[PDB]
Structure 1
Amino acid sequence: SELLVNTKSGKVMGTRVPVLSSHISAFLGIPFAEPPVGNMRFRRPEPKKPWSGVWNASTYPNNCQQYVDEQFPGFSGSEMWNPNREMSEDCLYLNIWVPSPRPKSTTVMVWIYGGGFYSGSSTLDVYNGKYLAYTEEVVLVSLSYRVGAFGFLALHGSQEAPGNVGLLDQRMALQWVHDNIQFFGGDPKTVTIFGESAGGASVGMHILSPGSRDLFRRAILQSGSPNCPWASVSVAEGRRRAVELGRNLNCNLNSDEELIHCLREKKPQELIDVEWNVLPFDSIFRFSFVPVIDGEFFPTSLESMLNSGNFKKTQILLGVNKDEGSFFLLYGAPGFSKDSESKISREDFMSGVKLSVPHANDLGLDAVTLQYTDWMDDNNGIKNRDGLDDIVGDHNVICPLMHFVNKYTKFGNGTYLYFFNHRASNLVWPEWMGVIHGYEIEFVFGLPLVKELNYTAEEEALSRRIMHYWATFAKTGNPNEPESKWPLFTTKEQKFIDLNTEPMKVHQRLRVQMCVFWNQFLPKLLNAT
C-alpha cells in the first residue's frame, strides 16, 4: 500500500490527505529519537529504538514544552504561532508529505521551525507541507527539536547538560532523513534544509558544524543567520544563565550535578515560568536559552569559521523581510501598541534604542540614535517609529545576514538573495507593522492557493512563484527554470531581487549603508570604548 512504508527503524502507516481538489500521502508523528524525558532532560538525544509492528503515523505529534504567547488572547495574529497540539517533553517526531503516486527518487526539503530557540511547533497551520509537496512534487519534511531550557540549557564541561542538544535533535532528524527518506521516494543526496528566524540560524549552524555538513545538499535561510546577535552565547554566559535559572527555582548551586538534578525534578512549566528572568539585560529580541559556542558543535568562534571558510560549500538561497523589527517592538518597547498607530516620542525612541542594543555603552547608543534620526524632523512620531523598526530589523536580522552572505559567498558555490516586501492583504496585525517577521512563510508554504483563506489572485501568483523558486533551487541549486531571471549574488555586484506582487526588480547592496554601520563601525566603536 502507498500509505505503508518500511523504514530502517520499522514500518509506518500514513494517511491520505486532501489538497487543492486532489490528494497526497502524509506520515505524521514519526519518532526519530528516544523521548528526552526524565534523566534524559538536557542530555544529547538518543536514536529511536527500532519497533516491531506498524507505527500509526496518521496524526500530528505533541509539541515540545514551551512558553505560550498570551499577550493577545483570542487574537489569531499571535495565536497562530502558539503550540496547537498538547505540549510534552516527548516531542521528538518528524512529519513527511509525499506526492501521490509515490515518487522514486525526488527532491527533498526539510523545514526547521524557529521562534528564537524558545518556541516553535512543526504542526502550525502555516507549516502544512501538503501544498508545497503537492504543487512542486517534492517530499516535504518538517522536523522538531527541544526549545527553551529543555534544548539549550548549557553547563559546559558537564555531559548531562552540555548545551546545543536542541541542535543535536535537528541533526538526528536530518540523519534519519538521510538514512530513510529513500523509502518514501525522496533522494537523500538532494536534501535542502530550510528554516525561518531561529530555524534560519539553525540552517546556517548546520552549514558551519562539521558533524552536520554531510547530512544535506543545499540550504535556504529565511530572516535568520547563524551569526545573529541573539542566536548564540559564550560558554560562560550559558553557564551563568543556567545557574540563574536554578536560583529562580531555589536549586542547590554547589555543583553542576546538584543544579541539573534539581532542574530535572521540576515540572516543565516551572522552568518555563522563570525562563525569561535569566536574561542579563533589559532588552528585546534576546532569548534565554540558545546555542553555545562550545568548541564541539562549533569548533571555534563563528566569525573565525566564516573568515577561514570553515564550512560546507554548496549553494544557498536566503533573504529577509521589509519590517523584521516591528513584532519585537510591539511586544516590548514603550510607546508601541497593537491598536494604535504607535507614533513614538523622542523619549520612547531613546528607550527603544537602549532595549535594542543592550550590550552598548552610551557612546554606542548615541551612534545608533544619530544614525537613525532625521534631525530635520526629530519629533516626527512616524519617523521615530519607523526608525526603531529599522534599528531592530537591521541589527538583529538584516545586517547579520548580509555579513553571513558576504563571508559565505567568498567560498560558496552559488548564492541567491531576496528581499520580501509584500504585506498580505488579509493580515490582522496593524498596518504600522508592515511586512512582519515570519510572514513570508505562508507564501513559501502556499497558503494563498487556498481560496477560503481570502488571498488575492496576485498573492496566489506570488506564492506559486516563490514555491517554484524554492523547489527549483532545492532540486538544481538554481531558483531559475532552465521569465525574468533571479540573478546570482556575487561579491562584486551583490545583486538581489524583491519578492512582491509587482514585476520583479533587481537591486544591489541591500541596506549597505546601515549594515556597514552595524557590521563594521559599531563593533569597532564598542571595542575601542
Structure 2
Amino acid sequence: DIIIATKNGKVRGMQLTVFGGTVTAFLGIPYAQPPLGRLRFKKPQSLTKWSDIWNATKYANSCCQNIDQSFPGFHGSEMWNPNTDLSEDCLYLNVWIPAPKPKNATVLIWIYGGGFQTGTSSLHVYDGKFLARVERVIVVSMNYRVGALGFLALPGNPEAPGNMGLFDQQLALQWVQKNIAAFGGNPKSVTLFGESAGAASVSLHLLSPGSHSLFTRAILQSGSFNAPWAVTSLYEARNRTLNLAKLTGCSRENETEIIKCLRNKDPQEILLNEAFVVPYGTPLSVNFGPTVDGDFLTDMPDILLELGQFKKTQILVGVNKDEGTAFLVYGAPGFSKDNNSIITRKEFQEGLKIFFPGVSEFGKESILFHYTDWVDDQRPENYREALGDVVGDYNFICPALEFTKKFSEWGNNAFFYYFEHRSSKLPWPEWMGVMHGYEIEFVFGLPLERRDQYTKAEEILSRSIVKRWANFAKYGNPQETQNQSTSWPVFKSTEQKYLTLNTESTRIMTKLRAQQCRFWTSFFPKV
C-alpha cells in the first residue's frame, strides 16, 4: 500500500506493472475548489483540505466540451474525444512516479491541446507511465477548463476575466511546487511540455510573471502563442461574449448581470451555442481562447516576445511535416479521408475561402500565387499538397520557427526539431502524411510497448526521442549521448539549424521552409 501525505491531505496511489518493472500512479488528485455555481467563469480557488485518505486510483472527470462527431466509429478522430465523464467538476491532476520511489527526480508536466476548446489529461496517448518507468522521471498532467467555461472574457471584470483555463494550469504548477517533494520530485527541476493549444499554453507561461518561478524549462510541440489561432483580441473576445449572451437569451445592460445569467444556464446550453458566437468559423476556430487580461497576460504577447520580456531558460520547439492535413477533411471541398482527394484549382480557391474567411480577395490571390507555382510535372496532387502546406505553414510551422528565432535572440539555448515519421499504425489515409498530433505517442513512449504492434524502427525512434526529451528536462540539452547519435545543435538566428526525427537517418539541416515563412511572417500580416 502507498499513501503520500500532501499539504492538503493524504492520497492513495496504485501500482502498475510496466516492462517488468513498476510505476506508482496517482490518477485524479484534486487541485482546486470545483468551479461550480458561483465560481463558474472565475479564477480557480484554493483547496479546502481533507482528513482521511483520498483515493487517486482512477482518472477523474474531463471538463465540459463539445465532441468531434464528424466520424463516428473512426479511431483517427475518436481517439481525441474524452474518455471520462464530462463535468464542470474537472480540476484534477495525475502523478506517475517510478518505483522504487525516487529521491529527487526531474519533473515533466504535460499540458494537452485541443484548440483551447477540447481535451483531457486521461487520453491513452498522454499516459505517463512509460516515461516514469524508462527514464525515472515523474510525470504530472492536469485538466484545465476549455471553451467558454475556460476563456469567456469580459475584460477587467472578475466575474469573467478570461484566461481561467490558464490559471487552472498555473494553479496545478503551484500544487507541484508545494507538493511534489513528498512524491520524490525536484520542484527545482520542472519542465513543461505540451502540444498545439498545450504548446501555446507552454509559451504563455514563459511570458507570465505569475508562472516565472513554477518551472525550469519548456518544450513546445506544434504550437506557440504567436500562432494566428492562439490569442483572441479584446475586440473579438467581447463580440463573442455578447453573441453568446444574446444566443442564450442573457443579453443585459449591466455586464455583471450578463454573467449572473450565464451562470444559470446549464452546461449543455453554453456548449451548444459556442460554435455560433462567430459568423464565419474555420476548421481551426478557437472561439474562446487566451486574452490579454492585464493579469495572466500583461500586454500583447507579440510585444513581450519582441522586446525580450519572458523567462530566460532553454526551449525545445518542433513541428511535424504535414501539420495542415488533419484540418482539410473538416470542411475543405473535395477532401475526404476515404479517397485520395485530388482536388482542382477551383477547389483550392474555395479551400482558401474556408480557411481564410476574410481576408481580402488580394490576400487570397497572394497565397495562391506563392503556393501554386508548379515545378512542375502536373502532378494531379499539386493543389491537394499545396492546400495542406498553406494550412500547416501559416498555422503552425512558421509561427513556431518565428518564436524560436525571436526567443533565441535574447541569448538562450534553443533546439528545434522537424518530425517526419508517419506512424505504421496511423488510421488516417496516406495522403495526409505525418499528421498534426501524431508525434505525441512517440514522446510518451507508446512504441516501447512491444505488445502494441509498432515496427522495430519505431520502437528505436521512440526510445531515442524519450531519451532526448528526458535529457532536455534534467540537463537542458536534448542529446542522446550513448549510441553514436547525431548531435542536436542549438538553433541560432543566422544559421537556423534543426534536427530531423525519422526512422532512417536523422540529419542536421538549416532554414526550414525559408521561402514560405518569409511570405507568412513578413508579407501576409500586412494584407
Once the two structures are superposed, residues 316-335 of structure 1 have per-residue CA deviations (whole angstroms, 9 ceiling, x without a partner) of: 00100011111111112111
Once the two structures are superposed, residues 269-311 of structure 1 have per-residue CA deviations (whole angstroms, 9 ceiling, x without a partner) of: 1111121111243423121100012232212111110111000
CA contact 2:156–2:293 (8 Å) conserved in 1: no
Corresponding residue number in structure 1 for 2:127: 128
Once the two structures are superposed, residues 306-359 of structure 1 have per-residue CA deviations (whole angstroms, 9 ceiling, x without a partner) of: 111000010000100011111111112111111011111111100111222334
How many residues are paired up? Answer: 524
1:221 and 2:223 matched: no
Separation in structure 1 between the aligned mates of residue 243 and residue 120 of structure 2, nearest angstrom: 27
What amino acid is the match of 1:510? L
1:295 and 2:297 matched: no
Please report how far the alpha carbon of residue 402 of structure 1 lies from its aligned counterpart in structure 2 after TM superposition: 1.0
CA contact 2:374–2:382 (8 Å) conserved in 1: no
1:25 and 2:24 matched: yes
1:521 and 2:526 matched: no
Separation in structure 1 between the aligned mates of residue 242 and residue 95 of structure 2, nearest angstrom: 39
SS of equivalent to 2:230: coil
Matches within 5 A, 1:158-197: 158-197=157-196
1:108 and 2:107 matched: yes
Corresponding residue number in structure 1 for 2:371: 372
Please report how far the alpha carbon of residue 375 of structure 1 lies from its aligned counterpart in structure 2 after TM superposition: 4.9
SS of equivalent to 1:265: coil
SS of equivalent to 1:352: helix
Corresponding residue number in structure 1 for 2:513: 511
Separation in structure 1 between the aligned mates of residue 308 and residue 502 of structure 2, nearest angstrom: 33
Separation in structure 1 between the aligned mates of residue 60 and residue 229 of structure 2, nearest angstrom: 28
Once the two structures are superposed, residues 175-233 of structure 1 have per-residue CA deviations (whole angstroms, 9 ceiling, x without a partner) of: 11011111111100000000000000000000011111111000000000011111111
SS of equivalent to 1:25: strand
CA contact 2:413–2:491 (8 Å) conserved in 1: yes
CA contact 1:15–1:57 (8 Å) conserved in 2: yes
Corresponding residue number in structure 2 for 1:334: 333
CA contact 2:464–2:480 (8 Å) conserved in 1: no
SS of equivalent to 2:154: coil
Corresponding residue number in structure 2 for 1:307: 306
Match of 1:491 among 490, 493, 511: 493
Corresponding residue number in structure 1 for 2:502: 500
What amino acid is the match of 1:356? F
Separation in structure 2 between the aligned mates of residue 27 and residue 185 of structure 1, nearest angstrom: 13
SS of equivalent to 2:263: helix
What amino acid is the match of 1:492? T
Please report how far the alpha carbon of residue 452 of structure 1 lies from its aligned counterpart in structure 2 after TM superposition: 2.9
Once the two structures are superposed, residues 99-137 of structure 1 have per-residue CA deviations (whole angstroms, 9 ceiling, x without a partner) of: 000011011000000100000110001111000111110
Separation in structure 2 between the aligned mates of residue 445 and residue 85 of structure 1, nearest angstrom: 20
Corresponding residue number in structure 1 for 2:469: 470
Matches within 5 A, 1:200-239: 200-239=199-238
Q: Which range moves more in the overlay, 107-116 or 348-357? A: 348-357
Separation in structure 2 between the aligned mates of residue 347 and residue 250 of structure 1, nearest angstrom: 41
What amino acid is the match of 1:486? W
Separation in structure 1 between the aligned mates of residue 172 and residue 279 of structure 2, nearest angstrom: 32
Please report how far the alpha carbon of residue 378 of structure 1 lies from its aligned counterpart in structure 2 after TM superposition: 10
Corresponding residue number in structure 2 for 1:242: 241
Separation in structure 1 between the aligned mates of residue 313 and residue 124 of structure 2, nearest angstrom: 31
Matches within 5 A, 1:274-289: 274-289=273-288
Q: Which runs of 5+ in 1 are unaligned?
A: none
Q: Which range moves more in the overlay, 46-55 or 245-254? A: 245-254
Separation in structure 2 between the aligned mates of residue 284 and residue 127 of structure 1, nearest angstrom: 24
CA contact 1:204–1:225 (8 Å) conserved in 2: yes
SS of equivalent to 1:281: coil
Separation in structure 2 between the aligned mates of residue 360 and residue 437 of structure 1, nearest angstrom: 24
Please report how far the alpha carbon of residue 429 of structure 1 lies from its aligned counterpart in structure 2 after TM superposition: 0.6
Separation in structure 1 between the aligned mates of residue 357 and residue 212 of structure 2, nearest angstrom: 33
Q: Which range moves more in the overlay, 484-493 or 89-98? A: 484-493
Please report how far the alpha carbon of residue 376 of structure 1 lies from its aligned counterpart in structure 2 after TM superposition: 6.6
Matches within 5 A, 1:382-397: 382-397=381-396
Corresponding residue number in structure 1 for 2:55: 56
Q: Which range moves more in the overlay, 74-83 or 198-207? A: 74-83
SS of equivalent to 1:407: helix
Please report how far the alpha carbon of residue 505 of structure 1 lies from its aligned counterpart in structure 2 after TM superposition: 0.5
CA contact 1:497–1:505 (8 Å) conserved in 2: yes
CA contact 1:315–1:412 (8 Å) conserved in 2: no
Separation in structure 2 between the aligned mates of residue 326 and residue 516 of structure 1, nearest angstrom: 21
What amino acid is the match of 2:507? K
What amino acid is the match of 2:505? P
What amino acid is the match of 1:39? R
Residues 282 and 62 (structure 1), Cα distance of their counterparts in 2 relative to 1, 3 Å cut: closer
What amino acid is the match of 1:374? D
What amino acid is the match of 1:498? T
Residues 229 and 280 (structure 1), Cα distance of their counterparts in 2 relative to 1, 3 Å cut: farther
Once the two structures are superposed, residues 490-513 of structure 1 have per-residue CA deviations (whole angstroms, 9 ceiling, x without a partner) of: 112110011110121100011111
TM-score by length of 1: 0.97
Matches within 5 A, 1:34-113: 34-113=33-112
Corresponding residue number in structure 2 for 1:438: 437
CA contact 1:152–1:290 (8 Å) conserved in 2: yes
Please report how far the alpha carbon of residue 412 of structure 1 lies from its aligned counterpart in structure 2 after TM superposition: 4.2
Percent identity, aligned pairs only? 53
What amino acid is the match of 1:327? A
What amino acid is the match of 1:499? L
Please report how far the alpha carbon of residue 254 of structure 1 lies from its aligned counterpart in structure 2 after TM superposition: 2.1
Q: Which runs of 5+ in 2 are unaligned?
A: none
Separation in structure 2 between the aligned mates of residue 183 and residue 420 of structure 1, nearest angstrom: 36
SS of equivalent to 2:400: helix
Corresponding residue number in structure 1 for 2:353: 354
Please report how far the alpha carbon of residue 141 of structure 1 lies from its aligned counterpart in structure 2 after TM superposition: 0.5
Q: CA RMSD in A?
A: 1.3
Once the two structures are superposed, residues 225-280 of structure 1 have per-residue CA deviations (whole angstroms, 9 ceiling, x without a partner) of: 01111111111211110111112212233231222122111111111112111124
Please report how far the alpha carbon of residue 144 of structure 1 lies from its aligned counterpart in structure 2 after TM superposition: 1.4
SS of equivalent to 1:349: helix
Separation in structure 2 between the aligned mates of residue 434 and residue 205 of structure 1, nearest angstrom: 30
Separation in structure 2 between the aligned mates of residue 439 and residue 391 of structure 1, nearest angstrom: 19
TM-score by length of 2: 0.97
